[PDB]
Amino acid sequence: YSGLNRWHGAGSTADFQKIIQERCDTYTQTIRPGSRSRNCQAIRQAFMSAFISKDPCKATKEDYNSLINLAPPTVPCGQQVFWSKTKELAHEYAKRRRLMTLEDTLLGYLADGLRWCGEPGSSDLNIWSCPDWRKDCRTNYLSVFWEVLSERFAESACNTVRVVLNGSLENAFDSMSIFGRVEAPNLRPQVELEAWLVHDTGKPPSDSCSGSSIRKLKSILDGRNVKFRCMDNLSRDQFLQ
Ligand SMILES: *[C@@H]1O[C@H](CO)[C@@H](O[C@@H]2O[C@H](CO)[C@@H](O)[C@H](O)[C@H]2NC(C)=O)[C@H](O)[C@H]1NC(C)=O
Fold this sequence. Notes:
By secondary structure, the protein is α/β, with parallel strands linked by helices. The chain has 2 domains: 1-73 and 101-156, ADP Ribosyl Cyclase, Chain A, domain 1 (Up-down Bundle), CATH 1.20.82; 74-100 and 157-241, NAD(P)-binding Rossmann-like Domain (Rossmann fold). 38% of the residues lie in helices and 13% in strands. It contains 9 helices and 6 strands. The protein has helices at 16-31, 40-51, 65-70, 87-97, 106-111, 141-156, 178-183, 212-224, 236-240, and strands at residues 9-10, 81-83, 129-130, 160-166, 192-199, 227-235. Helix 1 (16-31) packs antiparallel against helix 2. The longest helix is centred in the N-terminal third of the chain and has 16 residues, at 16-31. It is globular. The termini are far apart. The structure holds a molecule of 2 linked components (NAG-NAG). The site of a molecule of 2 linked components (NAG-NAG) has 10 residues, from helix 4. A molecule of 2 linked components (NAG-NAG) binds at residues 85-86, 88-89, 166, 168-169, 198, 200, 236.
C-alpha cells in the first residue's frame, strides 16, 4: 500500500478515457440525439479536467460544476425512475416503458459502472488503485460525482416519479443510500412518488409497504410535501407486464 497502489479500492477502469468518448458518441448520435449538437471531445475533456492530477481523497462537489452545467441530467416530467438495489430490474422496466433512470441521462450513461481517480502532479489516471469509500475516504471523485449528479436529477423531477425497490431485502429502503440521503430529500413539493417493492420470482417477499424501512421513507416525503403511494407483494413478471 504505497505510491499509486496505496488505496484499498480497485484502480480506475482500464481504458476509461476511450470508454467515455465512445459512450458519448453512442449516446449523442444513436441513443438520444438532442436538439443541438454536443461536442463529445469537449465533454470528455471537462470530465477528465474535473479530477485529473488532483488528490483523490479531496474531491468536492464544486469540482464537477463545469461538467454538470455542460450536460444537466434533465428528464421530462412524469418520466423519471429512481432505484435502489434493483439495478437490472429497474433498467429493464424503464426501457420497456420508455422512461429514464439516471443512467439514461448523458452523464449517467457515460459513467455507469466505471471507476476513476487521478494522482497529484500527474496527468494519468491511476490504474493501480483508487480510494475505497469505506476504507480510504468518502470524499473521492467517484463517490462525489454520483452524489452531485443524483441531487440534480432529483431536484429536476416533476409530476409523478417512480422508485423501484427490492422486496427481497430486509430493508427495501436504506436511509443511507443515495436514494435515501440525496434523492428523496431533494424532491420538490407537488411531486408524487410511487414506490414499487419487487421480490425475486418464486420467493416470499422480505419487506413490505407496511414495514419499518418504508415508514422512514414516508417521513422524508411528508417533510417535503410529496404524495406517496406504495405498492408491494409482486415479482418481476407482474411488475414488467
Ligand atoms: C434484490 O437484491 C438481491 C441481492 O442483491 C438480488 O439478487 C442478486 O442478484 C445478483 C445479480 O442478478 C446476483 O449476482 C446475486 O447472486 C444475487 N444475490 C442474492 C442474495 O440473490 C436480486 O436480484 C434483487 N431483486 C430484485 C427483484 O431486484
